[PDB]
């Protein structure tokens, strides 16, 4: 969101926002520290969202995203 004073997200709803509007995902877990699991989602507008890291429909589109970003192979962020 605005001035994230915190690395995770808040709370995953129901079923988010579809996931072929994102652009690129964080991938949040307790592995990394923080209470609530999540996949964030930041969509074309810029703005992330909480998705659930468990649900198979998340899985489907973290696997796209993750093709897509791997063709940029030098990460600084």
Not at 15 to 25: E, H, L, M, T, W
Not at 29 to 40: E, F, S, T
Request: proline share 8%; with cysteine; hydrophobic share 30%.
């Amino acid at each position: 969101g605005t001035n994230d004073a915190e690395d995770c997200c808040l709370s995953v709803t129901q079923k988010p926002i579809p996931g072929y509007i994102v652009r690129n995902f964080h991938y949040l877990l307790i592995k990394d520290g923080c209470r609530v699991p999540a996949v964030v989602f930041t969509t074309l507008r810029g703005r992330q969202l909480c998705a659930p890291p468990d649900q198979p429909w998340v899985e489907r589109i973290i696997q796209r995203l993750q093709r897509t970003s791997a063709k940029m192979k030098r990460r600084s962020s």
